[PDB]
Amino acid sequence: CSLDQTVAPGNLTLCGNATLFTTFRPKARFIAPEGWMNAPMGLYQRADGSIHAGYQSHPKHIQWGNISQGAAYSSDFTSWTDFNGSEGYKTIWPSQIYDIRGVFDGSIIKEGIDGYPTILYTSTSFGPLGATLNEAEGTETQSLAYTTDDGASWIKLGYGAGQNPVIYEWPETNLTGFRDPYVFQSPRLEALLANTTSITNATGDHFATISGGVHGDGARLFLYRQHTTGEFIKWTYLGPLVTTGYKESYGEWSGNYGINFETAGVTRLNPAGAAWDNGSDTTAVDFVTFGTEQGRADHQNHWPLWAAVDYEVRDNGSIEAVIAYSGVQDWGRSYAYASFPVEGYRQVSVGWIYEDDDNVILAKQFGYQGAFTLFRDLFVKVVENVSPSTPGLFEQASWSTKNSTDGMSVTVTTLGQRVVPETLAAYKGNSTVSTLAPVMLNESAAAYTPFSSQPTDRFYALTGSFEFGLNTTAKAGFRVLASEEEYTDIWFDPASENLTVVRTASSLIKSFGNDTELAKVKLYEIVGAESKTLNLTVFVDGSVIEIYANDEVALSTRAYPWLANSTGAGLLADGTTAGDVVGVSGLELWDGLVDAWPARPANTSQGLVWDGPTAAMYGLFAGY
Amino acid sequence: CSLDQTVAPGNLTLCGNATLFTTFRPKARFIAPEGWMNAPMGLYQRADGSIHAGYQSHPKHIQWGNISQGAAYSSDFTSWTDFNGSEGYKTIWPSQIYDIRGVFDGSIIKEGIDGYPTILYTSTSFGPLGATLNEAEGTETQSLAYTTDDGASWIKLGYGAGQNPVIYEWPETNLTGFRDPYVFQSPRLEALLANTTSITNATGDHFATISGGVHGDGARLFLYRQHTTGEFIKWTYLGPLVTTGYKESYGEWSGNYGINFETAGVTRLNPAGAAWDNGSDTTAVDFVTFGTEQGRADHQNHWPLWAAVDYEVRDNGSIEAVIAYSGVQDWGRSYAYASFPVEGYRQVSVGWIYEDDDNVILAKQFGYQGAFTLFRDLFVKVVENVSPSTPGLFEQASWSTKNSTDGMSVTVTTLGQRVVPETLAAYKGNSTVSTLAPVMLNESAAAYTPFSSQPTDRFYALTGSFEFGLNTTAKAGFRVLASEEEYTDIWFDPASENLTVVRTASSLIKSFGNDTELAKVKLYEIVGAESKTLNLTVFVDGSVIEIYANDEVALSTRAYPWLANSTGAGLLADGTTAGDVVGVSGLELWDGLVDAWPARPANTSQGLVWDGPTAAMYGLFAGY
Ligand SMILES: *[C@@H]1O[C@H](CO)[C@@H](O[C@@H]2O[C@H](CO)[C@@H](O[C@@H]3O[C@H](CO[C@H]4O[C@H](CO[C@H]5O[C@H](CO)[C@@H](O)[C@H](O)[C@@H]5O[C@H]5O[C@H](CO)[C@@H](O)[C@H](O)[C@@H]5O)[C@@H](O)[C@H](O[C@H]5O[C@H](CO)[C@@H](O)[C@H](O)[C@@H]5O)[C@@H]4O)[C@@H](O)[C@H](O[C@H]4O[C@H](CO)[C@@H](O)[C@H](O)[C@@H]4O[C@H]4O[C@H](CO)[C@@H](O)[C@H](O)[C@@H]4O[C@H]4O[C@H](CO)[C@@H](O)[C@H](O)[C@@H]4O)[C@@H]3O)[C@H](O)[C@H]2NC(C)=O)[C@H](O)[C@H]1NC(C)=O
Ligand SMILES: *[C@@H]1O[C@H](CO)[C@@H](O[C@@H]2O[C@H](CO)[C@@H](O[C@@H]3O[C@H](CO[C@H]4O[C@H](CO[C@H]5O[C@H](CO)[C@@H](O)[C@H](O)[C@@H]5O[C@H]5O[C@H](CO)[C@@H](O)[C@H](O)[C@@H]5O)[C@@H](O)[C@H](O[C@H]5O[C@H](CO)[C@@H](O)[C@H](O)[C@@H]5O)[C@@H]4O)[C@@H](O)[C@H](O[C@H]4O[C@H](CO)[C@@H](O)[C@H](O)[C@@H]4O[C@H]4O[C@H](CO)[C@@H](O)[C@H](O)[C@@H]4O[C@H]4O[C@H](CO)[C@@H](O)[C@H](O)[C@@H]4O)[C@@H]3O)[C@H](O)[C@H]2NC(C)=O)[C@H](O)[C@H]1NC(C)=O
Ligand SMILES: *[C@@H]1O[C@H](CO)[C@@H](O[C@@H]2O[C@H](CO)[C@@H](O[C@@H]3O[C@H](CO[C@H]4O[C@H](CO)[C@@H](O)[C@H](O[C@H]5O[C@H](CO)[C@@H](O)[C@H](O)[C@@H]5O)[C@@H]4O)[C@@H](O)[C@H](O[C@H]4O[C@H](CO)[C@@H](O)[C@H](O)[C@@H]4O)[C@@H]3O)[C@H](O)[C@H]2NC(C)=O)[C@H](O)[C@H]1NC(C)=O
Ligand SMILES: *[C@@H]1O[C@H](CO)[C@@H](O[C@@H]2O[C@H](CO)[C@@H](O[C@@H]3O[C@H](CO[C@H]4O[C@H](CO)[C@@H](O)[C@H](O[C@H]5O[C@H](CO)[C@@H](O)[C@H](O)[C@@H]5O)[C@@H]4O)[C@@H](O)[C@H](O[C@H]4O[C@H](CO)[C@@H](O)[C@H](O)[C@@H]4O)[C@@H]3O)[C@H](O)[C@H]2NC(C)=O)[C@H](O)[C@H]1NC(C)=O
Ligand SMILES: *[C@@H]1O[C@H](CO)[C@@H](O[C@@H]2O[C@H](CO)[C@@H](O)[C@H](O)[C@H]2NC(C)=O)[C@H](O)[C@H]1NC(C)=O
Ligand SMILES: *[C@@H]1O[C@H](CO)[C@@H](O[C@@H]2O[C@H](CO)[C@@H](O)[C@H](O)[C@H]2NC(C)=O)[C@H](O)[C@H]1NC(C)=O
Ligand SMILES: *[C@@H]1O[C@H](CO)[C@@H](O)[C@H](O)[C@H]1NC(C)=O
Ligand SMILES: *[C@@H]1O[C@H](CO)[C@@H](O)[C@H](O)[C@H]1NC(C)=O
Ligand SMILES: *[C@@H]1O[C@H](CO)[C@@H](O)[C@H](O)[C@H]1NC(C)=O
Ligand SMILES: *[C@@H]1O[C@H](CO)[C@@H](O)[C@H](O)[C@H]1NC(C)=O
Ligand SMILES: *[C@@H]1O[C@H](CO)[C@@H](O)[C@H](O)[C@H]1NC(C)=O
Ligand SMILES: *[C@@H]1O[C@H](CO)[C@@H](O)[C@H](O)[C@H]1NC(C)=O
Ligand SMILES: *[C@@H]1O[C@H](CO)[C@@H](O)[C@H](O)[C@H]1NC(C)=O
Ligand SMILES: *[C@@H]1O[C@H](CO)[C@@H](O)[C@H](O)[C@H]1NC(C)=O
Ligand SMILES: *[C@@H]1O[C@H](CO)[C@@H](O)[C@H](O)[C@H]1NC(C)=O
Ligand SMILES: *[C@@H]1O[C@H](CO)[C@@H](O)[C@H](O)[C@H]1NC(C)=O
Ligand SMILES: *[C@@H]1O[C@H](CO)[C@@H](O)[C@H](O)[C@H]1NC(C)=O
Ligand SMILES: *[C@@H]1O[C@H](CO)[C@@H](O)[C@H](O)[C@H]1NC(C)=O
Ligand SMILES: OC[C@H]1O[C@](O)(CO)[C@@H](O)[C@@H]1O
Ligand SMILES: OC[C@H]1O[C@](O)(CO)[C@@H](O)[C@@H]1O
Ligand SMILES: O=C1C=CC(=O)C=C1
Ligand SMILES: O=C1C=CC(=O)C=C1
Structure with missing residues (x-):
């Protein structure tokens, strides 16, 4: 094994573990200290204004397994510090019958159990697990943990009746998946449901989606509502929020909806960033961001997508998110975008960039796999004074068009993404x-x-x-x-x-x-x-x-x-x-x-x- | 629910949890503080001369599950003190993928990892587990932990290659069971194998049996030998030590060998107690003690048995224990006898007494299930000057006979059991x-x-x-x-x-x-x-x-x-x-x-x- 980068590469498969550790390794972005990483998780802005970022982690391995939350923090999204505890940079790991197969993705309730930051995460146990396998109820459940030390450690609720796991019953039969709980507050959904709370008895100020699908019948995003404000055990299933067809495509601008959703989230944006209005801001747009699987021939069968949606209230006190237009969050080797709120009316998104070594030929020689994307501000991108002769403009595939009164110009609306300004300023x-x-x-x-x-x-x-x-x-x-x-x-x-x-x-x-x-x-x-x-x-x-x-x-x-x-x-x-x-x-x-x-x-x-x-x-x- | 014990009992199934806690409860013997207990485990005499007793434990439940080691200690087998740590009276619990289904029975290496007391225990994971089910390799493995604080806590070896679990490959196909590792030193077996160690390369000073059987073909006790003295990872399978037939019975005095062994152990006794000789003591006898399952119509399908054996060396450097005579350790509602060495050339045995509430009708009202037997000294019982007109004397079913030179009297040899004298003195x-x-x-x-x-x-x-x-x-x-x-x-x-x-x-x-x-x-x-x-x-x-x-x-x-x-x-x-x-x-x-x-x-x-x-x-x- 020669590391001479002034001549042709030899047979690098003969090189020892982690001999290529520095050769190709990113230095300017979020990445685990070593080993396997995938999806961002547990993202929140702490009380001191710093950003806590978790990630799916398997230290000292270069394939997925025993999946755990690794974690770090930053004051500026750009310069990071690892947590360091009894399990190194891990802060949540498999430890109970309900999560021993993996601590999958989860999201943060900022004011949760006893007023502490609280994660709702997918706790996995034994059995076939996957959209193409015959999964059974119990394999994927949803569980709580809270932190009394700002993310240095997490305390799980106890195992049992009225404790963990808190969500375990499948809301529909023959699920392809049931994971990646996304907790959010929504003045918009609270206002839409306020006339129907007698039907469901769910009146809490938090919602959660769970990502999945139905065998043979396409992807589903399931909507739950916290049953009572200030109580975190009981979550009431309202209904499917997003329903798409088996390998349905909205077209060339929109990837494919595949068979199952992963890491879905829900937000509301306006031209400046995050929108906290109840529907009163006519410039604000409801968005869902979501991964799909088995709708793509390459890129690990994975599309990271987004859709603008119009909410409709069902007679049973649930919400239908009707897709208005549908786009792609990243066209390359990235997936598992998570978004979270940041002070100053911001909604910040970040994903995972996998390697391009799908046959695992040099993964051991690297001694690591994976990185984050850069952190991105989401906003409503508005383009004014668009010419109606713009080719394809009125297909409105991953954008909306609104004519001027006189029909001689168009306002275009789409999802905007830009690198957080803290990173651009620090880089420059x-x-x-x-x-x-x-x-x-x-x-x-x-x-x-x-x-x-x-x-x-x-x-x-x-x-x-x-x-x-x-x-x-x-x-x-x-x-x-x-x-x-x-x-x-x-x-x-x-x-x-x-x-x-x-x-x-x-x-x-x-x-x-x-x-x-x-x-x-x-x-x-x-x-x-x-x-x-x-x-x-x-x-x-x-x-x-x-x-x-x-x-x-x-x-x-x-x-x-x-x-x-x-x-x-x-x-x-x-x-x-x-x-x-x-x-x-x-x-x-x-x-x-x-x-x-x-x-x-x-x-x-x-x-x-x-x-x-x-x-x-x-x-x-x-x-x- | 009336607790009036001066009138007929009412419908006690209406009584609350643990309302009958004191009514029937033993006070003079080993019992868990509350909840479910079964087999004794992890028995050893500590360096200060006190006795450490573990037991299969499920606190706050009255059926088996999440099975853990509860523990206590005594200077006299009679008056006990609970351990009290972060998990109450538990000291080992399910915590890793290899043992998350239960910490089953185990036994002690007194001078083990880094010179500390070390337990070899059955680590269980997912899958069908049982002598009547289709168990697969990996469901039952054998793992190590050691204590640096005399049993207050145990540190497991890490999960992985060359660490836990240390025994995982089935020595024969289609096992009915593979559990209850019994670690022992044996000058006798070392002397018998000393001429064959070139065949197996196993030269350590510890042996271990594992209890099980073969589907359709009876029970087996598998013999392992520590590969190298002072090293505890590598255990070499020698061969089956005890082989019995599918529901074979040696007769009326001997219970039934069932389909699968549990909690088997190996010892050597003489008339005074434990025998440490290499075969030179003509008064010493090799004994195996073992539970059998599915050879009995009642008593939870369980026989606690013992056999006197004569060892034969096989050409492949393994030991065949040929049964000489075969008896019953306890004829009642007890099972899972464990024996361990005690200072003064003693071998002490103790078992588990289950309740007689097999339909679980008042278990919740009790708030506990199970106790130990009393602690028993084992020895060779010798009866001299026995009359040859003793009815049935020469069947030699659960005893041996040796004629005098003149044929007018007989020496009878069997397993002796008596309550440890410390308990009889304290009771009196x-x-x-x-x-x-x-x-x-x-x-x-x-x-x-x-x-x-x-x-x-x-x-x-x-x-x-x-x-x-x-x-x-x-x-x-x-x-x-x-x-x-x-x-x-x-x-x-x-x-x-x-x-x-x-x-x-x-x-x-x-x-x-x-x-x-x-x-x-x-x-x-x-x-x-x-x-x-x-x-x-x-x-x-x-x-x-x-x-x-x-x-x-x-x-x-x-x-x-x-x-x-x-x-x-x-x-x-x-x-x-x-x-x-x-x-x-x-x-x-x-x-x-x-x-x-x-x-x-x-x-x-x-x-x-x-x-x-x-x-x-x-x-x-x-x-x-
Ligand atoms: C199979 O068996 C398994 C083993 O038994 C079992 O797992 C165990 O489950 C139990 C029951 O769920 C868990 O017990 C809980 O523990 C929670 C705390 O957990 C954290 O801390 C413990 C203990 O930490 C000490 O010890 C460790 C190890 O030595 C040290 O490292 C620590 O530093 C710490 O040391 C100090 O304390 C020691 C003694 O305790 C001292 O010896 C020492 O010197 C130190 O000073 C850790 O072990 C835990 O780690 C494990 O779990 C984490 C994930 O959480 C993993 O990452 C890690 O690897 C480990 O696996 C963890 O760090 C307790 O909070 C909890 O008690 C609350 O809940 C119950 C309700 O269920 C109540 O009865 C109890 O009163 C508590 O509730 C109150 O408190 C909270 C907030 O404080 C409130 O929200 C709540 O309403 C309530 O309020 C009450 O009090 C208030 C004020 O005081 C009052 O105002 C209120 O009105 C009210 O009265 C519970 O004890 C246990 O951790 C599990 N153990 C393990 C090893 O997994 C498993 O589930 C079983 N499986 C099955 C299938 O059955
Ligand atoms: C999925 O992910 C899981 C999570 O990552 C993973 O489980 C984890 O596995 C790892 C790897 O196996 C385990 O790490 C081992 O830990 C052993 C110690 O374990 C005991 O102690 C820890 C830590 O305890 C501290 O923190 C807790 C929690 O806060 C406190 O309660 C304690 O009080 C204690 O606190 C002090 O220290 C803290 C920092 O560490 C401070 O923050 C604090 O302020 C305190 O001062 C506990 O967490 C453990 O509890 C868990 O496990 C028990 C069962 O064991 C459960 O009952 C419990 O519920 C928990 O689950 C436990 O109590 C280490 O000994 C071990 O390190 C040795 O081994 C490796 C080899 O593999 C060596 O690299 C390392 O050097 C060590 O070897 C040396 O040392 C021993 C003897 O000391 C020698 O035998 C050996 O040869 C070697 O000698 C060396 O040093 C000598 C002198 O120094 C020298 O002479 C020699 O020559 C030589 O150099 C290893 O770190 C980890 O515990 C698991 N964690 C959990 C939560 O389960 C899981 O496996 C994964 N699963 C899969 C499928 O992959
Ligand atoms: C006394 O100790 C028991 C523990 O043994 C404590 O808990 C109770 O345990 C029993 C089992 O021994 C449980 O019985 C089972 O109940 C389920 C149906 O449960 C649902 O309906 C209940 C009735 O109103 C309700 O209490 C339950 O609520 C709890 O659990 C939910 C999670 O589902 C949780 O969200 C809540 O917060 C509560 O903790 C629940 O909604 C039933 O399906 C079982 O039936 C099987 O077994 C029976 C009897 O053999 C048989 O008839 C059936 O055919 C089937 O085979 C079983 O009845 C009971 O639910 C537990 N109660 C709890 C947890 O509160 C009990 O609390 C202790 N008492 C005291 C006072 O401390
Ligand atoms: C570099 O990092 C690796 C971790 O990735 C470290 O460990 C080695 O990992 C690889 C996997 O990446 C292991 O390869 C597999 O090996 C088994 C067969 O293993 C047996 O034979 C080995 C060869 O002499 C021997 O080293 C092994 O000994 C260890 O494990 C036993 C437990 O069995 C333990 O008791 C010992 O103490 C050792 O720890 C073992 O006896 C093989 O079956 C696997 O084959 C699959 O995959 C290959 C390749 O894709 C394929 O060809 C097969 O068809 C099949 O699909 C696989 O090769 C390797 O055994 C690990 N070595 C260990 C643990 O020592 C490695 O140590 C790191 N190097 C350094 C220098 O740190
Ligand atoms: C390309 O970038 C330039 C430079 O940032 C953009 O020009 C600015 O656009 C905003 C929004 O209309 C104006 O208010 C600024 O004053 C412009 N600055 C200039 C021209 O230097 C330009 O709009 C971008 N083009 C596209 C197509 O995105
Ligand atoms: C019944 O118990 C008595 C009293 O312990 C036993 O008698 C003793 O037996 C031993 C062994 O032979 C003698 O050395 C003692 O001196 C005897 N003491 C007596 C007679 O009081 C008696 O052997 C026991 N019988 C049986 C059948 O076990
Ligand atoms: C760079 O390195 C290669 C290989 O050493 C060399 O052949 C080449 O001339 C160098 N310069 C450029 C700009 O390619
Ligand atoms: C590279 O070395 C490997 C061993 O890692 C060998 O199997 C493979 O054939 C080699 N490729 C060559 C010589 O082209
Ligand atoms: C990186 O460190 C590891 C672990 O010590 C070592 O095995 C590896 O060879 C090192 N690689 C480089 C490029 O230094
Ligand atoms: C509400 O209605 C929707 C649409 O029919 C359905 O899919 C969902 O399951 C219903 N909610 C319930 C039954 O809670
Ligand atoms: C929008 O403007 C274009 C170009 O003037 C025109 O063809 C189209 O019919 C208009 N749509 C509406 C709803 O007026
Ligand atoms: C360099 O980067 C650091 C870390 O992000 C940042 O805080 C600092 O402001 C940057 N320096 C500049 C822009 O001069
Ligand atoms: C004991 O109690 C029962 C029920 O109270 C009573 O009928 C009986 O006379 C008492 N004495 C004896 C020795 O049975
Ligand atoms: C005892 O009460 C139970 C409820 O625990 C009831 O089902 C049973 O029939 C009762 N037995 C009677 C009245 O004989
Ligand atoms: C024993 O204590 C338990 C737990 O506090 C209580 O529920 C039970 O009623 C008590 N039983 C008796 C006989 O005092
Ligand atoms: C040794 O021989 C016995 C009796 O034939 C056999 O059962 C056992 O598996 C053998 N040991 C091995 C193959 O290690
Ligand atoms: C033992 O003694 C009995 C009674 O004297 C006799 O019937 C029998 O044949 C003897 N056995 C031997 C081996 O001498
Ligand atoms: C009473 O029992 C205790 C506890 O076993 C024992 O130590 C003590 O000697 C006994 N008292 C006597 C025999 O006087
Ligand atoms: O590591 C497991 C996690 O990764 C994902 O599969 C996305 O790739 C999530 O759906 C899951 O929670
Ligand atoms: O609790 C499990 C334990 O109990 C037994 O089944 C005996 O009844 C052992 O074989 C096992 O190790
Ligand atoms: O080696 C190191 C790994 C992680 C970290 O935070 C600092 C140093
Ligand atoms: O309540 C108690 C339980 C156990 C123990 O050891 C002492 C007191």
């Missing part, structure tokens, strides 16, 4: 910033033009505004993690409305994924404009490439170039001519970003372990 | 002792003659020597827990060789068992004697009646008379005449015995709880 302030001269890409443009300033390592951000003719057939974008022999190409092709990441040359290491990523991006043409603009921001962080377009479209992916000098970046141009010119302006390189984990040394591996022969006997976990 | 010293005049039972004897001194409560011992003609057809014994309308009759009938406990009138409460108990007792006639003698000792302790005959035969049973004055005792006589006279001498009543738990108040109930609806979903425990 800690970086070497190069402001680049604007570039016209014409007949003289090479396929690839390196920027006048170059990154020094695999930790940088790029931004630019690409101005295209209304009838362009030109393509442009950014090349990143680039040497002569390895590079990753990010293209936008306005004629197809496709943003692509081409990874055929991303790495000399052939075991990593090399498939092309694709997002749809609608350039809303403005009345009187003779051009259309893509604002593209790219974060490069070890192996993570995280792309944002127009504060709307996000695409997370992975690239693992071997060579030490595969760090370069610049402009891509295809079919640019004297007549079909792409104007590039607002160009900036941020080299370095931030050390997100300042207390951690470069190598936080503790080694890997095998569960031994009993892993295959129990049949619950891979064992490594 | 704390009691009001009445020494009773000898009585000849003849033509003038009533059916029942009360003793001249009477007990004052349900806590007393009786002793007597019953001298019968060699050709008697008379019956005699003791009546206990007796008023005019409730009583328990203990009869010996030399003509049938049957000791019976008749319980048709034991209680006015009709839901308790009322079936007749039976033991076989051989009166070894002595050369030159014109009579044969039964020495009978009876302990009455709440509802426990524990009978010992001739330091050989034990019979534990239960009686639950309702009336406050059902406490009397005396002599029984049937078919005694001027010619067929039973001489009764050495008569003594010990009234009061000892308060075995001086720190405990009279009512140690903490209430009962229900596990709720998930108990039936998981399907492992009754839930109450």
